[PDB]
């Protein structure tokens, strides 16, 4: 929910960022699933079903899933996310 957004900065580990990005075909948006215990997403404060709003300050709400994946995969050693829960 945009009424309570969350900022999270992830430091990439040996297994990447330690989460799955999921999307539902036909519905807008991407969301966090399968946060790995003790991994970067966990330590950064991400929770299951968080929806990604911005990647490194870029609004991704209207971008296709494959583009959001590519932004995160291309970020380098860290990435900053604006997300919101529910």
């Amino acid at each position: 929910s945009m009424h309570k957004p969350k900022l999270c900065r992830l430091a990439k580990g040996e297994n990447g960022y330690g989460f799955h990005l999921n999307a539902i075909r036909g519905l807008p948006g991407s969301f966090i699933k399968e946060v790995q215990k003790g991994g970067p997403a966990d330590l950064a404060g991400l929770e299951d079903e968080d929806v990604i709003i911005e990647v490194n300050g870029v609004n991704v709400l209207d971008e296709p899933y494959e583009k959001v994946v590519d932004r995160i995969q291309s970020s380098g050693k860290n990435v900053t996310l604006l997300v919101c829960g529910k």
Binding site: G16, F19, G26, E34, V69
Partner: peptide, 8 residues
């Protein structure tokens, strides 16, 4: 309900 998933 087709779900896309990517490990990151």
């Amino acid at each position: 309900l087709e779900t896309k998933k990517t490990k990151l």
